[PDB]
Homo-oligomer: A and B are copies of this chain.
């Protein structure tokens, strides 16, 4: 389904619906029955949008709730939008949302992390107030991405189980907006940027969907039109192009114009002229080997759960720049698109990942066979392929995105894993031939055990030697780590990114014994992993788990959450922060370090 990022243009207006909404639980599950969307939510309180609903109220009972919740506000449609295509859009509703404009149901979506939107024109009058009601469901089952099991106790009270290591935050996490186009409008663009080997010339393929004649012009940073073309498709030539390079991010603008006899639409699409290719064991960007540094992240912070926030984005990017990070992965769900707009503009390299985590009952009563009709089945695979389609639909034109991760840490031991994953790998490549693909690999599915990694282009490993196994023993951990990395190099001859390596670290726990949970062990352990990486030629990246401490469901393994942060959840540095800064700022930009 076509999904361009709304942008204000001579032909296009946006009105944000972010702010205080009315909010109500639905403990009874009668809000659909009683059509709660007809009148004011009856027992309601104020809530911030965007935000997770769970932590806004300092209330355990709302935090831990499973079921439906209701959001509602009134909004004036701009007078002067009369005779315009009016769209209502939600950047994200976690995990499921149904929307009513007054009494007309207009939208339904499953998938907590990518946008959905409807033509609401026939259900609103320009200059009049409208009521927008949302039913938001946070329940996971074997056909949701990610999967889960609702457990219903003898009293019929629901309790979400899930297999991923981060809290099941829900609500309207990202901006809600009414926006306009002319009734003739550009509905979809696809740009591919080819780059010659000598880097001295580049072609830009375009493809456009719009109910009118299409023209495009390519403008550089100085606004100088550098190329033009006509019709739904073609190829712009660019001599001596300003390449989009990691650390710089030079953007052109592709102005696409949809022109009927009466009216016209204008969409500016930012373009980074760059190519991305695996070549043996090297990850090439503009024909030059790249070395990833930086983090697995999460969309997580105090009070707002996974809600988008501009101060948080500005602050975290200052921290990643300070520390010398050149890259990250959207672990483990599509991130707010303003993150990909920031990366495009600042030349930050991103591994874009789906919400497909938790396909693994072995990370600790769960179904006996992971790949079966009672768990991951043909429906689950369909839901997964849909998850992949929406992510690529959103993110295909972000030059910051260099690789698709279609899943995180699935159990690949069973016969079934390869039957499930092979067609998803093939479909992903069809949806976007321009980027390499990966499936992030769990520690127990080692080089000798794993049955799917040959189907993907880049080997993305999550390794905790010296933490979950060889606990506290850097000596034995180093031998085991180096042995396995070389066994993967021999097995597949792919580029290897260590997408996770980290240890829980209590900020302020200090030890002369350099033992587990201390700041000092975090430092020694990352240091050991770095020496190993620098001795294996197939290793082309290191992404520390995690940028910051983050919330998980409660358990004996999590001291108030996951403490593998380099920074605390309030973004204060642990000692290891200064260790990463030395290594990452001390290396040459984008180049594998040396002994």
**Bound complex: CA A311 to CA B308 (Å):** 11
**Bound complex: CA A70 to CA B21 (Å):** 33
Pick from B47, B129, B345: contact of A314, CB under 8 Å: B47
Pairwise interchain contact B318-A78, C-beta atoms closer than 8 A: no
Pairwise interchain contact B322-A58, C-beta atoms closer than 8 A: yes
The answer to whether A79 and B13 touch (CB under 8 A), given A569-B570, A570-B302, is yes
The answer to whether A311 and B56 touch (CB under 8 A), given A127-B10, A302-B302, A571-B302, is yes
User: Quick check: is A59 within 8 A (CB to CB) of the other chain?
Assistant: yes
Q: Which residue from chain B places its CB closest to the CB of A12 in the assembled complex?
A: B76
**Bound complex: CA A48 to CA B315 (Å):** 9
Interface hits, A33-88 → B, CB 8 Å: 46-49, 51, 55-59, 75-76, 78-81
Q: How many copies does the complex hold?
A: 2
Pick from B10, B79, B126, B304: contact of A311, CB under 8 Å: B304
The answer to whether A56 and B314 touch (CB under 8 A), given A13-B76, A76-B8, A78-B78, is yes
User: Quick check: is A303 within 8 A (CB to CB) of the other chain?
Assistant: yes
The answer to whether A311 and B303 touch (CB under 8 A), given A80-B80, A569-B570, is yes
Q: Chain B residues with Cβ under 8 A from A79's Cβ?
A: 13, 80
Q: Chain B residues with Cβ under 8 A from A315's Cβ?
A: 55-58, 303
Q: Chain B residues with Cβ under 8 A from A302's Cβ?
A: 302, 570-571
Pairwise interchain contact B76-A310, C-beta atoms closer than 8 A: no
Interface hits, A269-324 → B, CB 8 Å: 302-304, 307, 309-315, 318-319, 322
User: Quick check: is A16 within 8 A (CB to CB) of the other chain?
Assistant: yes
**Bound complex: CA A587 to CA B328 (Å):** 53
Pairwise interchain contact A311-B322, C-beta atoms closer than 8 A: no
Q: Which of A16, A49, A80, A322 has the most CB of B within 10 A?
A: A80
Q: Chain B residues with Cβ under 8 A from A48's Cβ?
A: 309-311, 313-314
The answer to whether A311 and B319 touch (CB under 8 A), given A15-B15, A80-B80, A570-B302, is no
The answer to whether A310 and B51 touch (CB under 8 A), given A58-B315, A58-B571, A315-B57, is yes
Interface hits, A1-31 → B, CB 8 Å: 8-10, 13, 15-16, 18-20
Q: Which residue from chain B places its CB closest to the CB of A59 in the assembled complex?
A: B318
Q: Chain B residues with Cβ under 8 A from A310's Cβ?
A: 18-20, 48-49, 51
Interface hits, A230-271 → B, CB 8 Å: none
Q: Chain B residues with Cβ under 8 A from A127's Cβ?
A: 10
Q: How far apart are A550's CB and chain B's nearest CB, in angstroms?
A: 14
Q: How far apart are A480's CB and chain B's nearest CB, in angstroms?
A: 36
Pick from B58, B304, B312, B570: contact of A319, CB under 8 Å: B58
Which residues of chain A have a CB within 8 Å of any CB of chain B?
8-10, 13, 15-16, 18-20, 46-49, 51, 55-59, 75-76, 78-81, 126-127, 129, 302-304, 307, 309-315, 318-319, 322, 342, 345, 569-571
Can you list 23 A-B contacts with CB-CB less than 8 angstroms, sorted by A residue number? Answer: A9-B76, A13-B79, A15-B15, A18-B310, A19-B310, A20-B310, A46-B314, A46-B342, A48-B310, A48-B311, A48-B313, A56-B311, A56-B315, A57-B314, A58-B322, A58-B571, A78-B78, A78-B80, A79-B80, A303-B311, A307-B311, A309-B309, A570-B570
**8 shortest interchain CB distances as A-B pairs:** A80-B80, A48-B310, A48-B311, A304-B311, A57-B318, A8-B76, A303-B315, A51-B311
Q: A20-B314, A57-B314, A302-B571 are in contact. List 19 more A-B contacts (CB 8 A).
A: A8-B75, A8-B76, A10-B127, A13-B76, A13-B79, A19-B310, A46-B345, A49-B310, A56-B314, A58-B318, A58-B322, A58-B571, A59-B322, A80-B80, A303-B312, A304-B311, A307-B311, A309-B309, A309-B311
